[PDB]
Enzyme design. Structure first.
Site, PDB file in Angstrom:
ATOM      1  N   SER A  79       0.823  -1.206   0.000  1.00  0.00           N
ATOM      2  CA  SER A  79       0.000   0.000   0.000  1.00  0.00           C
ATOM      3  C   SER A  79       0.859   1.259   0.000  1.00  0.00           C
ATOM      4  O   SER A  79       0.484   2.273  -0.599  1.00  0.00           O
ATOM      5  CB  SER A  79      -0.941  -0.008   1.202  1.00  0.00           C
ATOM      6  OG  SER A  79      -0.263  -0.426   2.375  1.00  0.00           O
ATOM      7  N   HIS A 125      -4.977  -1.958   0.297  1.00  0.00           N
ATOM      8  CA  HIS A 125      -5.732  -2.153   1.527  1.00  0.00           C
ATOM      9  C   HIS A 125      -5.825  -0.836   2.282  1.00  0.00           C
ATOM     10  O   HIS A 125      -5.124   0.133   1.977  1.00  0.00           O
ATOM     11  CB  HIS A 125      -5.104  -3.237   2.412  1.00  0.00           C
ATOM     12  CG  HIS A 125      -3.803  -2.835   3.033  1.00  0.00           C
ATOM     13  ND1 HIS A 125      -3.715  -2.311   4.305  1.00  0.00           N
ATOM     14  CD2 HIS A 125      -2.535  -2.887   2.560  1.00  0.00           C
ATOM     15  CE1 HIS A 125      -2.450  -2.054   4.587  1.00  0.00           C
ATOM     16  NE2 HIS A 125      -1.714  -2.395   3.544  1.00  0.00           N
TER      17      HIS A 125
END
Lengths: 217, 148, 193, 338, 227, 174, 187, 133, 179
Positions: free
Chosen positions: H41, H66
């Site tokens: 991420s 995420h």
């Protein structure tokens, strides 16, 4: 592509002084051991005598060996190393044609003490307030069968036979005399009675008391 | 620089590292001179046998310890059966090196490899792991040939 | 935790001896197996004809500790009715398969897990292949015993036992772990029309 | 020589000869150096070869310790496919996990290895989750499925084996020998030792006399004598189990049933005679062992020490202490005990 | 049991409550050996052997053994105390026996050494550790030779084999099945179930050594050719 | 202590339900079945959570009881007590008006080999499909409404838990 | 930042190349050891020339006493200063944004996370010395609020009520609150 | 002239991904983002922060998407203030992705609910990359 | 159990000798002497070592007992149990025919001040001198021979322990003792 040739004292006096304190001792042909016999510190002392016998011009200046260590046996009694590491030290030190002037600062615990008498006879230097100890060596933690303890007994059998052969050449005694006097029990030696026994010969060169210098004034 | 000189002084480690140093010394075109100091463990005696035959020197205080490699790990039932066949194959692999370099039979290598077998300076020459007893003269010629 | 839970648990286990019900709980250890061997020979002494409802709920344990539990059930005179409550393990479902044929019961929401026994090897090179033969002795005998209990062949057992394999109680009837399912009859639920 | 300075250490000397040394295990600190080493050699020429040495345990330790993930092994093979120069890789000793994947991803024909090296491929290791929720396990299992299929994809282009064959052998850790890696597709040829060192070592044991004077002749004779006694032992084990099968076929000949013709009607109709079928069931013929060899002479062993037994005839009615089963078992004329 | 083990006992009466499980079994001349055989529980087995000696001098004292090993001198004190009492001792082997618990099941009286079907027995040389100076290394090898010479003639009296067979078995780690230990003389009777006559893989390897089973005809045994 | 109420057919689901903690309750559930299969059995739930393989052994042992099942929540029912609160007989499931009810997917862990992640993901999906079938039975709710609510942590009051189907009557008044 | 760079002809490290370019980087937390290197760097650049000093902050928090050592060196020097924000300044690192450069020299990235809260401390022992360290923490609390009120133009009574609790700012609210001066664009 | 960096990250906080995001747009010249292996991420923010038309990806690379994670403990009041912190950070990184993928923002919050992984095929369809190298 | 042997006047000395385990044997030894001063007390010694301070209290407790004492050595007797083995009445000293006997000096650690070291150095020497002169009484051995045998850290088989004077009789008719 050019060869990295080393420089010595008749040649490197124009290149200035060495920057670090072990490199001043390496130029003065003096090896100072302030650490017990670890596998890290035994590799440098082999390369040190290899460097002193690499491109030396005269190969006759005496090598000063100052030892201050526990050998392979610490103060508590267990073995932090093994006795086979000392066999690489004496085989590398005695290889060179230069004589070995041996000195002690404080202590020599059962591995450095047999190297103290192993130097050139007539020049065993020592401090007047040091401690010398000769005891038979011990082994580390080994967990084996009945025949595994027999082969470990043969390793210490060759340890007392090799250590007494050095003391028989130094002190001028028999093979069984050095096993009964030195390698039986954990004993200690002072500076004064070791000269009568045959461990050391004289003190350090240039030694003079500060009170004896005041008596001259 | 047609000859290399590597001082062998160690307590040994994993058996996989002793295979690589033995295979590398038998691959280069230059000569390989091996000198041992102290002992030669299972990772060190393969470098002792990895040198060329004729210039393997050991001193009078030098010893030699030969033993089978250890290992093992935790796992399932059939996972232990795979690696136990590998340890038995590595133990046969190091037996091929000791039978070729020392000209010993294969059945007598595994008898000495079964237990921790120690050797002196005298019986190492008689076994075949070394060639002759080292002295001052065999290494005085080493330090004078590397200066040029 | 606190011993008051242990004291109230010690009471209801002591009432289970009056109903001929033994308890196999927790991990199968060496000391707990000796507590279960001595409690099985005592229930035969008061009566050698009535069955013993063995409670099996274990998440694992040692392999040789459960081996003393196995052969002490086959030589005693009455049969041992084994039931699966909650979870069966590799040493738990082997207790489940060691019961009498026709009296092995289970609940429809319990899990039956079977795999090869775990362990490890450490030591010399000869100590590896010897200790590997100990686990393969435990591997071949559990696969040999499970082939006689479920009635399957030898090769189809080790193809499922080599990995961790979970089993449902609906498929355990077709495979051969348990013989029947003890459950109350369901309620007359009306459909959605 | 004066304008070009010498290399200060050993990895800088191997860097000047275009030799990449992977001597460290696959940590994230060493993978950023290899993507900077291979990208630097591409800018110095896309036609010069790159020497690569492989000595690592991969992304995990050999004892089972998980120090990194298998995803850093994916980025190592991605630079080998992005580059456009011939790469010659040499396996040096150990090669576990992703270290043999970059060994097989080299150019075909230049993949080299030592004769005593170690190669192994297995499933990637997964760290524990730490008792998280339920739906993250399925996404973590999908992360396993994307990384396992990516490992089978890079392993198929380096060897040539299909995906379904490589997945079944990867469930268990299968170790690969250098003699076994030739038929598997890992390497292409075996690095041979120096032939000048081999003939000089063999001539040294003959001239110096150490191959016969140190007791090697008496010990090599015992190696051939123990192999002769071991070859005599299993041959006696094989003739005894052949006489057991010969006595089993002789006792089976005194049977009067029709169970053999029932299996013939449900099976195939071609081989109504005993013949080969070219399958698993290779039926041996033990009574067809009439050798008649006049070279295998028996030694100086007399068989007159065999005692005389009772020698009970075959036409006897004496039955052992067994359960009764003579419902349809009619008494044979050669075996009335049934 | 990972966290705790509850007290699995039963004492029930119409008027008074009885003792726990191990106290009731000790009153019925049954002794249990569980856990590591250290110096603490060695006085428990010897002290219970002297407790049941004063109760009756003719009834057979039974000892149940289930231990993965123990101290070599603590397991030595239970054998010679068991051989210096009046009545006979019926030994029953439970679980596994690793080089010390296999001695006490072989130290029973002849005809009363009962082993189960899935019991594991083991016989090896005793282990030990080196300590310090050569005056104690020579004392260590003289101690390990003393423990090996004492345990050698123990198996000669209870099994009646030769000393060459003991040195070939106790050289490495040798695990014995009760079907194999019945041939060696360690036990006297095999305990089976309701017609349980399964063949363990140690006998399938023994059948392969004598030439009774081959790879073509495996018979009604388990597979062994997967090496 | 708790022995005075064990004779009055009262059990306590206290503390974190582990493998040994679940063994103490389901052993008591069959003793009260052996004492009287006609009288009522009341279960008091106060648990902060637990494993799925230990808490599933309490559900089928409760459904094995032929008598009436009363389930009363006292305090916290975090992801395990809320499933056992609705698992009782309809018309007897009650709760205090200031208790917290949290519904959640059953927790699980996965480690070991990569081939164990094949097995550990299947038992999570099997436990999710098993619990969503049971929770949609006594609540009279479709499967699309159950799965969208249990996906995350969802605390709820007993006011909206009455119309959901976890409880039947409020015992604390309002 | 581990590979070095060049100044004009030789290899120099990246943080020391900007030291000659009069740019100061702070990436780690404010501790006692890194504050000794920062206030020794401010006196070194003040002795060479008199120009504007640039401070790039990435402080995720720190202690109170070494942060006041770096704050007092900004006003003691005779040169000018300018604080520019990239990343995040949490705790006492956000106070150093409002240290100097009040006349249009407080820049920030459009995605910088700002954080303002009252300082803290911990010292136990005797009950009599607990009153003295409480007077030290009270005298450090209102003095830190008086400097934020004069730099941002906020009233003093609002800083005591708001910064006693948890307070976080985006760069859109940092303009109207007077905490920063300008927002950095794409070039 | 043109900056070229290797993107490889499997973990780390997403707060450091915002620091490397705004540093890439501070450069006046273009940026070449080439992802290798894993992209977490914090790594996907630097992958989407590059110039449109020069974001390369390999055949075996994956991108992990995420929501942010954090650890909260203490008094009752600052949990509620920090609850709005993690919410608007998740709303901030949704607007970071929305400037490149040209998608409505309500569909990105549904993909940011759980962990979201992409192979080399649908990365081009979702706008995180440009072409396959 | 242990209470059944207590009413038959048989106690057990098992495990490592500690200060908490010392007075438990002394308190039950004086209770048997007050009950019956004519009936003998049989003890069982199995100890792998112990402290020289708490081990002497067991020796003074048997000397305080007016009735005769009987000893039995099973398992181990290392540096403390061998001293308590021969300390019983002569003619009533039995043991197992394969039990081991270890005669060695006790151990001890020293640390602290320089005057503190020389106090405990001569204290453990006075403990070495007192343990040698006490064990030389019931063994009928000279002092110079028994002071050097305790320095060797080698165990003793019960075959040579009989003519050494430490033990009188061996249970088993003296043919089951293995070398």
């Amino acid at each position: 592509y050019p060869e990295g040739r080393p420089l010595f004292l008749p040649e490197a006096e124009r290149f200035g002084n060495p920057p670090d304190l072990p490199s001043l001792l390496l130029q003065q042909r003096v090896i100072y051991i302030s650490m017990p016999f670890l596998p890290s510190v035994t590799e440098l002392v082999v390369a040190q005598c290899y460097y002193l016998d690499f491109d030396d011009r005269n190969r006759q200046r005496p090598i000063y060996v100052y030892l201050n260590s526990t050998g392979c046996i610490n103060d508590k009694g267990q073995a932090i190393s093994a006795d086979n590491e000392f066999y690489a030290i004496w085989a590398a030190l005695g290889f060179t044609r230069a004589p070995l002037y041996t000195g002690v600062t404080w202590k020599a615990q059962n591995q450095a003490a047999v190297l103290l008498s192993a130097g050139q006879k007539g020049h065993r230097y020592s401090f007047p307030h040091a401690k010398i100890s000769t005891a038979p060596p011990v082994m580390n933690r080994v967990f084996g069968q009945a025949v595994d303890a027999q082969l470990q007994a043969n390793e210490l059998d060759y340890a007392t036979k090799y250590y007494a052969a050095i003391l028989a050449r130094s002190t001028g005694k028999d093979l069984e005399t050095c096993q009964k006097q030195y390698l039986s029990r954990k004993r200690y030696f002072s500076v004064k009675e070791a000269y009568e026994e045959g461990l050391v010969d004289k003190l350090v060169p240039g030694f003079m008391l500060n009170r004896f210098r005041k008596m001259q004034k | 620089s047609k000859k290399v000189f590597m001082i062998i002084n160690s307590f040994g480690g994993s058996v996989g590292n002793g295979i690589t140093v033995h295979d590398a010394l038998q691959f280069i075109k230059a000569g390989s001179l091996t000198l041992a100091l102290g002992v030669a463990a299972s990772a060190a005696s393969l470098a002792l046998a990895g040198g060329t035959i004729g210039e393997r020197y050991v001193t009078e205080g030098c010893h030699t310890m030969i033993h089978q490699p250890e290992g093992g790990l935790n796992g399932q039932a059939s996972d232990i059966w795979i690696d136990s066949q590998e340890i038995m194959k590595i133990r046969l692999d190091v037996a091929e090196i000791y039978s070729l370099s020392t000209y010993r039979p294969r059945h007598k290598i595994l008898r000495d490899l079964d237990r921790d077998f120690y050797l002196t300076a005298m019986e190492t020459i008689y076994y075949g792991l070394a060639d002759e007893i080292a002295t001052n003269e065999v290494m005085h010629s080493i330090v004078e040939m590397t200066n040029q | 935790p606190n011993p008051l839970v242990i004291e109230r648990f010690q009471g209801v286990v002591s009432q289970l001896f009056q109903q001929r019900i033994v308890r196999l709980g927790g991990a199968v250890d060496d000391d707990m197996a000796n507590l279960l061997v001595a409690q099985l020979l005592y229930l035969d002494s008061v009566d050698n004809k009535r069955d013993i409802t063995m409670y099996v709920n274990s998440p694992g344990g040692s392999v040789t500790a459960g081996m003393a539990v196995f052969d002490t059930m086959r030589h005693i005179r009455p049969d041992v009715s084994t039931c699966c409550i909650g979870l069966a393990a590799s040493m738990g479902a082997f207790i489940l398969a060691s019961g009498q044929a026709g009296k092995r019961y289970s609940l429809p929401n319990s899990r039956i897990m079977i795999h090869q026994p775990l362990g490890g090897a450490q030591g010399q090179a000869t100590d590896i292949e010897i200790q590997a033969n100990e686990i393969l002795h435990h591997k071949l005998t559990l696969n040999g015993y499970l082939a006689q209990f479920t009635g399957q062949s030898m090769e189809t057992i080790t193809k499922d036992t080599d990995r961790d394999f979970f089993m449902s109680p609906q498929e355990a009837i077709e495979y051969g772990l348990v013989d029947a399912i003890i459950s109350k009859p369901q309620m007359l639920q009306s459909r959605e029309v | 020589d004066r304008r070009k300075p010498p290399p200060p250490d050993l990895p800088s000397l191997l860097f000047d000869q275009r030799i990449v040394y992977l001597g460290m295990p696959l940590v994230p600190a060493v993978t950023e150096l290899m993507v900077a080493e291979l990208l630097y050699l591409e800018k110095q020429g896309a036609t010069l070869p790159i020497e690569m040495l492989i000595n690592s345990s991969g992304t995990t330790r050999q004892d089972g310790e998980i120090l990194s993930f298998d995803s850093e092994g994916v980025a190592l093979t991605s630079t080998m496919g992005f580059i456009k120069n011939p790469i010659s890789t040499v396996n040096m000793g150990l090669a576990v996990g992703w270290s043999c994947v970059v060994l097989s991803f080299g150019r075909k024909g230049w993949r080299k290895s030592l004769p005593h090296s170690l190669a192994m491929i297995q499933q990637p290791r997964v760290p524990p989750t730490g008792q998280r929720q339920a739906i993250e396990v399925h996404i973590k299992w999908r992360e396993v499925l994307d990384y396992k299929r990516e490992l089978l994809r890079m392993f198929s282009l380096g060897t040539g084996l299909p995906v379904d064959k490589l997945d079944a052998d990867m469930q268990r850790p299968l170790y690969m020998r250098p003699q076994d890696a030739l038929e598997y597709g890992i390497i292409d040829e075996i690095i041979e030792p120096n032939e000048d060192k081999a003939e000089k070592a063999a001539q040294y044991w003959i001239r110096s006399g150490r191959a016969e004077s140190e007791g090697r002749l008496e010990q090599w004779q015992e190696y051939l004598s123990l192999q002769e006694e071991y070859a005599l032992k299993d041959s006696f084990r094989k003739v005894m189990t052949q006489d057991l099968r010969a006595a089993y076929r002789d006792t089976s000949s005194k049977l009067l049933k029709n169970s053999s013709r029932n299996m013939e009607q449900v099976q195939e109709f071609k081989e109504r005679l005993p013949d080969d079928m070219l399958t698993e069931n290779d039926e041996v013929r033990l009574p067809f062992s009439r050798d008649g060899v006049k070279l295998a002479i028996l030694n100086a062993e007399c068989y007159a020490e065999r005692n005389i037994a009772r020698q009970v005839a075959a036409n006897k009615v004496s039955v052992p202490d067994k359960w009764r089963a003579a419902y349809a078992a009619r008494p044979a004329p050669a075996a009335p005990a049934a | 049991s990972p966290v705790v083990t509850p007290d699995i006992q039963i004492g029930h009466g119409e008027d008074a409550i009885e003792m726990d499980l191990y106290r009731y079994l000790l009153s019925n001349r049954i002794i249990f050996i569980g856990g590591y055989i250290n110096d603490k529980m060695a006085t428990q087995i010897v002290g219970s052997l002297m407790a049941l000696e004063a109760v009756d001098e003719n009834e057979d004292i039974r000892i149940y053994i289930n231990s993965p090993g123990g101290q070599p001198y603590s397991v030595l004190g239970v054998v010679d105390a068991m051989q210096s009492i009046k009545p006979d001792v019926q030994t029953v082997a439970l679980g596994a026996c690793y080089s010390y618990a296999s001695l006490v099941v072989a130290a029973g009286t002849k005809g009363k050494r009962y082993a189960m079907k899935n019991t594991r027995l083991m016989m090896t040389q005793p282990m030990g550790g080196s300590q310090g100076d050569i005056y104690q290394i020579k004392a260590t090898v003289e101690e390990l030779n003393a423990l090996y010479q004492i345990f050698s003639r123990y198996y000669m009296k209870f099994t009646g084999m030769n000393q060459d067979q003991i040195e070939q078995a106790t050289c490495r780690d040798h695990f014995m099945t009760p079907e194999q230990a019945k041939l060696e003389g360690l036990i006297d009777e095999i305990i089976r179930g309701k017609g349980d006559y399964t063949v363990p893989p140690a006998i399938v390897r023994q059948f392969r050594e004598v030439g009774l089973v081959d790879d073509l005809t495996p018979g009604p045994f388990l597979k062994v050719d997967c090496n | 202590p708790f022995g005075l109420l064990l004779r009055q057919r009262i059990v306590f689901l206290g503390g974190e339900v582990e493998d040994f903690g679940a063994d103490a309750i389901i052993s008591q559930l069959l003793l009260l079945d052996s004492q009287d299969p006609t009288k009522d059995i009341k279960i008091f739930i106060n648990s902060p959570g637990g494993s799925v393989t230990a808490g599933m052994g309490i559900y089928d042992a409760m459904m094995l009881c032929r008598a009436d099942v009363n389930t009363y929540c006292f305090g916290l029912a975090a992801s395990m007590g809320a499933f056992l609160l609705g698992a009782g007989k309809r018309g007897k499931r009650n709760s205090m008006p200031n208790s917290r009810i949290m519904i959640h997917q059953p927790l699980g862990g996965a480690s070991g080999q990569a081939v164990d992640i094949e097995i550990q993901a299947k038992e999570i999906m099997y436990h999710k499909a098993n619990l969503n079938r049971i929770m949609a039975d006594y609540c009279q709710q479709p499967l699309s409404k159950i799965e969208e609510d249990t996906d995350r942590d969802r605390y709820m009051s007993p006011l909206e838990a009455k119309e959901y189907g976890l409880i039947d009557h409020i015992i604390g008044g309002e | 930042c581990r590979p070095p760079g060049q100044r004009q002809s030789e290899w120099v490290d990246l943080w020391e190349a900007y030291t000659y370019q009069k740019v100061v980087f702070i990436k780690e937390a404010i501790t006692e050891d890194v504050a000794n290197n920062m206030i020794a760097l401010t006196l070194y650049l003040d002795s060479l020339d008199q120009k504007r000093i640039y401070y790039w902050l990435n402080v995720p928090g720190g202690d109170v006493v070494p942060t006041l050592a770096l704050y007092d060196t900004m006003q003691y020097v005779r040169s000018k200063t300018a604080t520019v924000c990239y990343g995040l300044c949490l705790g006492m690192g956000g106070f150093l944004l409002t240290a100097g450069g009040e006349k249009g020299y407080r820049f920030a990235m459009p995605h910088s996370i700002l954080m303002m809260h009252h300082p803290s401390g911990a010292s136990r022992g005797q009950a009599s010395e607990m009153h003295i360290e409480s007077r030290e923490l009270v005298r450090m609390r209102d003095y830190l609020s008086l400097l934020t009120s004069n730099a941002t133009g906020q009233p003093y009574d609002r800083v005591i009520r708001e910064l006693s609790r948890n307070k976080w700012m985006d760069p859109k609210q940092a303009i109207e609150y007077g905490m920063i001066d300008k927002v950095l664009t794409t070039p």
